[PDB]
Every structure is written in structure tokens, then in C-alpha cells.
Scaffold this active site. Structure first.
Site, PDB file in Angstrom:
ATOM      1  CG  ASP A 111      39.510  37.320  33.980  1.00 16.93           C
ATOM      2  OD1 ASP A 111      40.343  37.314  34.908  1.00 16.93           O
ATOM      3  OD2 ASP A 111      39.651  37.996  32.940  1.00 16.93           O
TER       4      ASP A 111
ATOM      5  CD  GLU B 184      39.656  39.915  37.952  1.00 19.85           C
ATOM      6  OE1 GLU B 184      40.856  40.125  38.233  1.00 19.85           O
ATOM      7  OE2 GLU B 184      39.261  39.764  36.769  1.00 19.85           O
TER       8      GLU B 184
END
Ligand SMILES: [Mg+2]
Ligand SMILES: [Mg+2]
Ligand SMILES: [Mg+2]
Ligand SMILES: [Mg+2]
Length: 546
Positions: A199, A241
Site C-alpha cells: 500500500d 499500489e
């Protein structure tokens, strides 16, 4: 086996959103386990679980206060291991979140660090006596945060956060921080998790006189993480990401030595532009500007997710275009983005929803389906931050859309109730019963895709018919050649394709294996209803059906 991710169909689901098994108003892991028949029946081969760890839930669980424990509403470590084995038993991999970059300000590390300047944890975070450091880093949550520094009175210093103020960034200049991450990695890969989503990975390191994105030191840590993962667990997968411009995204693949997968954030907003413009150029242009990637690496393709449709990495004029075309109500906007679901963005047009999914399923990469998009769920832009695209899964027309038997006022979020997308019109039970529902169309389409690994693994070459509304391309892998051709216009269209590289072959349409005219040397005329998408296997005479 090691490239398993190249053939997956990924389902993005939040545990809290899917099924409440004990009727306390919140979805949970045993409820998710009880719905695996539905997930398997859809055809997905890998479940990406949004954060399910201990958290105050102020950023939907991406504000973690303990990386080793589940949030109490979702169950126990042991519930998770039961889920993990049950999914594996069905041949379904599992991908989980590694929120590398920051913790909740309620994580114990930060609660120690803010207290005494001499604690072992003080340097776990990023402190500064002045709030003008890192001048050039933008604010991501521009609608909420005035600054990437907030003052902590208990600490007598400012601390750094790329996201919300209750998410202080970890300090990657501290070798102990890096070791905590690797131990979190090992803790979860040990249990048999197949993949980790990295993330907010472009924001690890900060540097002065720098925008604090995509720094070489960040890439350096990921080469280390990749090597660490490869040495102790074979055939896992790291997914980046990285919402950046194409050159910067491709770098997260390093050279085979960094991240196995990355989200194709460049293509995602251009699909909506191409469709609305009824012209293929946004798609083909952004792909021309996207460098090739290492051979073992894979793009993750998606249309929507648990966030807003991000317009951070499009031009200013494109952002304005997308706002005017897809977010006319200003409540639909959030930061530099559009907090709407797929089907509302596409005006509940079944042909547009199918077209976009066929693009998702036939471009080079691994497709992600966001939970509920397979039945055409809507949004609630009045809910606040991104909650309006995270409402409970719509199982039936019953109370709570069949998601729970709890008091409806105690649900973590209400189901969709607007007059077009209400769960009384959009639910799993309704669509299972009619063969032409969006759900059954999705099941059948995914089933075809899985017979054709060319879609995940093959090359691509785009055609250039003079009709600009028509997007057509060839996929090839081993002995299989696919022609995809689709009409981006809401009107009927004709186009001529130069298929002369394949003279003598016959296009066989994958849905019903119907044989189209043999490819000659003359241009090949296709003719399209509104938003019609065709996929053909180009086959020689000795392989025609019937
Ligand atoms: Mg529950
Ligand atoms: Mg950071
Ligand atoms: Mg072109
Ligand atoms: Mg239409």
C-alpha cells in the site's frame, strides 16, 4: 507456478462489507468463509482482502494499530486460518495488505514515541521542529489535510503523514523500522498467504529538495523486500499500489528484482475518457507512452476499487473533462477524483458495463473485480469520504439486502437505497434467477477467459482502422491468436480492419463459436451495434467447429 498471478481473476472485497455471520451489523471473516461458494461460482481465482487488522477504522482499516491482530469485529487469527485453508482447498489464492508506509496514531509504537524523546520508538516516526520541511511534496488528501505535518503537543515536534493526520508515516531511515516490516511480512507469509499488496508504496522515503515520491531509496528497499521474500517463501507475489505516470510506475517492476505486479493506474482513467469521447485515442495513446515491463512481471487491470476514481495522474484538462462528464454534481468529487461506482459512472448502461469489463478481461494483465460490480451496485455520495462505494454486498431484496439480520440502524453502513440502484432492484438472488442478468453474463465471460491464457500472458498489437470509434487489437500467445474489436460509440458503426497478416484464417467468435468470413487480403469489414464488443479466435480451416 511462480507466474501464477498472470492467470488469476482477482476479487477485491472488504471483510466488513461482505457478509455478517453473527448479526452484529458488521461483516466478518466467518461470513466471508460462508460465501466462498458464491465467490468460486463467479469464477475468481484469488481474493484480495482489504485491511482486516486492528484499527480505529478512521481510514477503513488502512490506519493499523497492531499488524499481528485482526480487528475484533472481523474475528480471530484462527478464523483467518480457517478462511485461508478453505480458500486454498478450492484453489483460490489469497492476497493481503501490507500497509508499509504508516500506522494508526493509536499503534503502540507511536504512543510510545510521542511520550518520551528517549524511547526506543522515538525514531520509528518522522519528526521535525518546523513544518516547512519537504516543501515540494503534495498533499494527497487535499480536501481534509492542510499540511503533511501536524503538531503533536505531547512530543514537542511536528510529525509527518502522507495521508490523514492520524496516520503518521514510518521512518525508513531507521533500520529497526525496516526490520519490523520484514517481520510483519514473514508473520503473514508464514501462514501461507499467497500475495501482499504494497500500500502507498511510492511514499516510503522522504528527502529534502525532493517531492518525496518514487525515490531511489524506496525502490532500493523493495529490491531488498523482493529478495527477502524470494529467499524464504517460493512463488509469492508482491503487488505495488503505485499511482504515478507510466514511466514512474514501470520502475516498480525494477528489472525482475522488485515487485511482481503493479496496478495499471495509467490506463484506468483513459478507458472512461475513450468511451465518453467515442474515440480510442486516450487508450492507445497512454499505452504507447507506457514502457514495456520485465518478462515475469504483470499489470493488474481494474475499472474501480474501494477508493475514488483517481484523477491525480491525468492532466489538468483531462481532470476537468472527467469532472464535467462523470461528476456533474460536486458532491461526486473527492480530492482529485470521483467517488462513484462503476455502474453509476456508466449511467447503468448494461452495454457499457459489459464493454468495459470485456476490455478489462482482454487487455494484457490480470483483472480485478471490485466486490459488487458483478451485479451492478451503485453508490451513495452522501456517505462521507469514500464510504459511498463501500456499502454492504447486496445478496437479496430482504432486510439489509440479506447482508445481516441485525437491527438495520446498527449496520456499519446502509445499503444502497436510491431509486435506480436500490438493493431491491440490484441483488445477487435476483440476478441468479435470470440467464441474461449481469451476474450470469459475468460468470460466462470469465469462464471463457479462463480457457484462454493468451489474455493474461500474450502480446498485444493495436490496429488502426480509420473509424476512430473502433478499438481493435490482436493478442497472441503460443499457438493462439485472438482478435478483439469493439465499438466505443453509442451509435452503430462500421470499420475496416487490415487483417492481412492472418490471410486464410477464420475469426471464430468465442461466445458461441460462430464462424465469420475467412480473412482475405482485402480489408475486413466489421459492423457494430452500439457499444458492441467482439472477440474471435483466428483459426485455420482444420480447426473450424461443427
Ligand atoms: Mg459480524
Ligand atoms: Mg513515508
Ligand atoms: Mg490511434
Ligand atoms: Mg448504450
Amino acid at each position: 507456478d511462480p507466474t501464477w498471478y498472470k492467470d488469476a481473476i482477482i476479487y477485491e472485497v472488504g471483510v466488513r462489507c461482505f457478509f455478517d455471520s453473527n448479526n452484529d451489523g458488521s461483516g466478518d471473516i466467518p461470513g466471508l468463509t460462508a460465501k466462498l461458494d458464491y465467490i468460486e461460482s463467479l469464477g475468481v481465482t484469488a481474493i484480495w482482502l482489504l485491511p482486516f487488522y486492528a484499527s480505529p477504522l478512521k481510514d477503513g482499516g488502512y490506519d493499523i494499530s497492531d499488524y499481528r491482530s485482526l480487528h475484533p469485529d472481523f474475528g480471530t487469527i484462527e478464523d483467518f486460518k480457517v478462511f485461508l485453508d478453505e480458500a486454498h482447498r478450492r484453489g483460490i489464492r489469497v492476497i493481503t495488505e501490507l500497509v508499509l508506509n504508516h500506522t494508526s496514531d493509536q499503534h503502540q509504537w507511536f504512543r510510545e514515541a510521542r511520550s518520551n524523546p528517549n524511547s526506543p520508538y522515538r525514531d520509528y516516526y518522522v519528526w521535525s521542529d518546523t513544518d516547512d520541511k519537504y516543501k515540494d511534496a503534495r498533499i494527497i488528501f487535499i480536501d481534509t489535510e492542510r499540511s503533511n505535518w501536524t503538531w503533536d503537543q505531547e512530543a514537542g515536534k511536528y510529525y509527518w503523514h502522507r495521508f490523514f493526520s492520524h496516520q503518521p508515516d514510518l521512518n525508513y531511515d531507521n533500520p529497526k523500522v525496516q526490520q519490523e516490516i520484514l517481520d510483519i511480512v514473514g508473520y503473514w507469509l508464514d501462514m501461507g498467504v499467497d500475495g501482499l499488496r504494497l500500500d502507498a508504496v511510492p511514499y516510503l522515503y522522504e528527502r529534502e529538495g525532493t517531492n518525496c515520491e518514487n525515490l531511489p531509496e524506496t525502490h532500493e528497499f523493495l529490491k531488498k523486500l523482493r529478495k527477502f521474500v524470494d529467499d524464504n517463501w517460493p512463488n509469492r507475489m508482491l503487488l505495488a499500489e503505485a499511482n504515478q505516470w507510466p514511466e514512474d510506475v514501470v520502475a516498480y517492476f525494477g528489472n525482475g528484482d522488485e515487485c511482481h505486479m503493479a496496478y495499471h493506474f495509467p490506463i484506468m482513467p483513459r478507458m472512461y475518457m475513450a468511451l465518453r469521447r467515442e474515440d480510442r485515442h486516450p487508450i492507445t495513446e497512454i499505452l504507447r507512452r507506457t514502457p514495456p515491463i520485465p518478462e515475469t512481471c504483470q499489470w493488474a487491470l481494474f475499472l474501480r476499487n474501494h477508493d475514488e476514481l483517481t484523477l491525480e495522474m491525468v492532466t489538468d484538462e483531462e481532470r476537468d473533462y472527467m469532472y464535467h462528464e462523470y461528476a456533474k454534481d460536486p458532491r461526486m468529487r473527492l480530492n482529485l477524483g470521483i467517488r462513484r461506482r462503476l455502474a453509476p459512472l456508466l449511467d447503468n448502461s448494461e452495454r457499457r458495463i459489459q464493454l468495459m469489463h470485456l476490455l478489462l478481461f482482454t487487455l494484457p494483465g490480470t483483472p480485478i473485480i471490485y466486490y459488487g460490480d458483478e451485479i451492478g451496485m451503485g453508490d451513495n455520495v452522501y456517505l462521507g469520504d469514500r464510504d459511498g462505494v463501500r456499502t454492504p454486498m447486496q445478496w437479496s431484496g430482504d432486510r439489509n439486502a440479506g447482508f445481516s439480520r441485525a437491527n438495520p440502524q446498527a449496520l456499519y453502513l446502509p445499503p444502497i437505497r436510491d431509486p435506480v440502484f436500490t438493493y431491491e432492484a440490484v441483488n445477487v438472488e435476483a440476478q441468479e434467477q435470470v440467464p441474461t442478468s449481469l451476474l450470469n453474463w459475468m460468470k460466462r465471460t470469465i469462464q471463457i477467459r479462463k480457457k484462454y491464457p493468451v489474455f493474461g500472458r500474450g502480446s498485444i498489437r493495436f490496429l488502426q482502422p480509420s473509424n476512430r470509434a473502433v478499438l481493435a487489437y490482436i493478442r497472441q500467445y503460443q499457438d493462439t491468436t485472438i482478435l478483439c474489436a469493439c465499438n466505443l460509440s453509442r451509435f452503430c458503426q462500421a470499420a475496416e480492419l487490415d487483417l492481412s497478416d492472418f490471410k486464410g484464417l477464420y475469426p471464430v467468435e468465442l461466445y458461441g463459436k460462430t464462424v465469420f468470413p475467412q480473412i482475405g487480403e482485402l480489408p475486413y469489414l466489421l459492423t457494430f451495434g452500439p457499444h458492441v464488443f467482439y472477440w474471435f479466435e483466428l483459426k485455420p480451416q482444420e480447426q473450424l467447429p461443427h
